[PDB]
Amino acid sequence: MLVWLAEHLVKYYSGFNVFSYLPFRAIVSLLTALFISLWMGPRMIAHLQKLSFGQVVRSHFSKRGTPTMGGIMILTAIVISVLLWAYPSNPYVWCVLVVLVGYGVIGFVDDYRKVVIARWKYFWMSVIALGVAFALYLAGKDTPATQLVVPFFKDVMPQLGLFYILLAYFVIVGTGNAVNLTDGLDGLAIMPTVFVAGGFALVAWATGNMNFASYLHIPYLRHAGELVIVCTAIVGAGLGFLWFNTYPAQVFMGDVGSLALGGALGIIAVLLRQEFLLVIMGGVFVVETLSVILQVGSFKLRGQRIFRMAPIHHHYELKGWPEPRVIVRFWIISLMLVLIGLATLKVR
Amino acid sequence: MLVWLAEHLVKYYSGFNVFSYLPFRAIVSLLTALFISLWMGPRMIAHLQKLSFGQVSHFSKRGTPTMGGIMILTAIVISVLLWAYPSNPYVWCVLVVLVGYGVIGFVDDYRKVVRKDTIARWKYFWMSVIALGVAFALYLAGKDTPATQLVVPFFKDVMPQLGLFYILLAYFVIVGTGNAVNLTDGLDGLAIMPTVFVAGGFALVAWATGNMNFASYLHIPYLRHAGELVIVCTAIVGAGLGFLWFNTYPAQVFMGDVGSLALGGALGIIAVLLRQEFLLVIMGGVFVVETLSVILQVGSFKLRGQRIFRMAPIHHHYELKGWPEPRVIVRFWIISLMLVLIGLATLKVR
C-alpha cells in the first residue's frame, strides 16, 4: 500500500516515480523484510522465552530451553513487507498472503496447544488449499495460466481441468509437510527456503515481461510480475530469521513459521505453473519426504530399517556427522538444485 | 579445451553447438569443478593428514590439515582449462595470478607446517612483482581504451581514464584483496562462502559486460573476450562450494595461505579485468571491514595503547565476546550475501 502513496504523491515531486520500478521495489522489499525481522528480534525471543519458561535469563552447543514460536517473526516480516511494497490490487499477492496467514495460524495454534491434533491440522490445510485452487481455477478458464509446464519440453503443455486443482492441492500440502519435517534441525528449513524463494523471484520476473516470457516459453501471467516482491520479501525474511536460527539456534523455527513458509513456496510454485521447478529447486524437502516414506514403508514391510532415522538429516546426524556440518552440506545441496532448476527453464 | 574438441568434431557430432553457448558451458563448468572437488576431497585430506602429522573428540582442534587449498586451486584450474577458451588473454591472466598466489601460499605453508618453522616478506615481494607484471601487461593491452577507464557507480557521467595510475590501482586492489582474504580465514568456512557469493556476482557482471547491447543498457565498459571470465568466476563458485563441503564448522580440512591467497588474488584480478574495483569493495565489504578493523585496532594499540576490540579480526572479536563459531560464520555469510545483492543493485542505478 505504501507504493500507492508514492504514485499518488508523485505529482508534487516527480522523483517518486522510481518506486514503481520492479527491481528497486524488490530490493527495498528485501531490505525492509530483513530490517523488520532484526528489529523484532531479541525483544521477540525474550517475550517468547518469558512466556514459555518464565526465567528470561539464559552450554551453547548443548542448547536447552530455547523458544519454539519464532515463526511469527517470519510471518510479520513477510506480511509487512508485502503489504508495504506490493500492489494490494493484485489478486495473486493476496492469494499468497492468505495462504501464508492460514498456514501460519494453523501452526501457531498447533504450537500453542503443544506448549499448553493431526486430523485438525490436515483438514484445515486441505480445505484452505482446495479453496485457493478452486478460486485460481475459476479465474484461469482455458488459459495458459492453468497449463501444466514440464522442463525439457515446449511442444507439450497439457491443459488441466480438475487435475489443476488436484495438483495444486498436492503441491501445496506436500511442500508444507516437507518443510514441517525438514524443521528437524535448526536452520535447515530456512536457507533452502531462501534459495528457492530467490529462484522463484527470478522465475516470476521472467514471467512478467513479454519479451522474456516469449523467449523462455514460460506461460504468461499478467499479474505474476508482482510476485517478485513477495518472493524477495520471503528471501529477506528468511535471511533475517536465519540470523538467529543458526546451529546455536537462539529461537527454534517451530511449525508456526515452517508451515507458512512451505505453503508460501508451494503457492508461488502453483501460481507460476512451476510445480516441477519447485520439486527440482526444493529437492531437499522432496528427498526428505521420500526418505521418511521409505523408512516407514520398510519398517512396516519388514523388520530391517533403511536409515537410522526417517529423515535424512537425522540419519546423518546420528551417523556421526555434527549438526552444523550436515546443515551446511544440505545448504550446498539446496543451492546446487536451485541453480539446476533455473537452468532447466533455459534448456527448454 | 573441450570446446575446441566440440568445434572440430561437430562435423559428425551434429548438434554440439550447445557446447559453445555461454550459459550452458558456465553451468557445466560449475558442475565439473564441484564434482571434481567432491571426488578428490577425501584423498587429499587423507594424504595431508598422513603428511602434516605423519599419522591418520567431536570438535577437536587438532588433526585438521592446514594447507588444503590445493583442492580449490586444482579444481579451478582444471575446470577453466577444460571449459574456457585458452585463446583469450583474460582467462590466462586470471589463471596465472591464481596459480602464482597458490604456489606462494603453498610454499609458505610447507615452510610453516612441514618444517615446523614460524617465507618472510619474500611472499610480499613475489605478490608485488606478479601484480605489477600483470598490471603492466594489461596496460600494454589497453592504450587509451575503455578497458582502463575507471568505473564509478551511481554516476555514469564521470569515468576518469587512468594512465600510470592503472598499475597502482591494480596493485592496491589485488594485494589488498589477497591480504584481506588471508586475514578473514581465521575461522573455518568464513573465507569461502563469501568468496562464492562475490564470484557469482562477478560472473553475472562479466556476462553483462560481454554483450554490446546489455553493456550499453547498463552503461558498463564493453570488454571484448571478457565473457569467458564468466567461466572462471563460475568455476570459482563451484570450487569454493565444493571446498565448503569439507570446510564447515567441523572443519575436516583447514585452508591455509594456499587457496586463501589464491582466491583473494582471483577476486582482485577479476575485479581489475572487469574494471569494477569499487564494486569489488562493495561485494567484499566483509573482507574490507575485517582488514580495516585489524588496522584500526593496531593503530589504537600503537598510539593510545588501549584496545577497543578483543582481537584484531572482527570475527575473533565477536566469538571471544560470547558468540559461538557457527553463529559468527553464518552471520557473516548473510552479511556477505546481502552486500553482494547491494552491489549488484548498485550496478543498475547510475
Numbering used by the authors:
A (entry chain E): 1 to 58, 64 to 121, 129 to 360
B (entry chain A): 1 to 56, 64 to 125, 129 to 360
Question: What sentences appear in the manuscript?
Answer:
The cryogenic electron microscopy (cryo-EM) structure of the YES complex containing wild-type EcMraY was recently reported, and this methodology was used to obtain the structure of EcMraY(T23P) within the same complex. As in previous A. aeolicus and E. boltae MraY structures, this electron density fills the hydrophobic cavity found at the MraY dimer interface. However, we uniquely observed this electron density extending into the periplasmic space above the MraY molecules where the environment is more hydrophilic. We conclude that the T23P substitution generates a hyperactive MraY, leading to elevated lipid II production in cells. Consistent with this possibility, tyrosine at position 21 has an altered conformation in the MraY(T23P) structure in which its hydroxyl group forms a hydrogen bond network with Y227 and K358 on the opposing monomer.
The structure of the enzyme from Aquifex aeolicus revealed that it forms a dimer with most of the monomer–monomer contacts made between the N- and C-terminal helices.
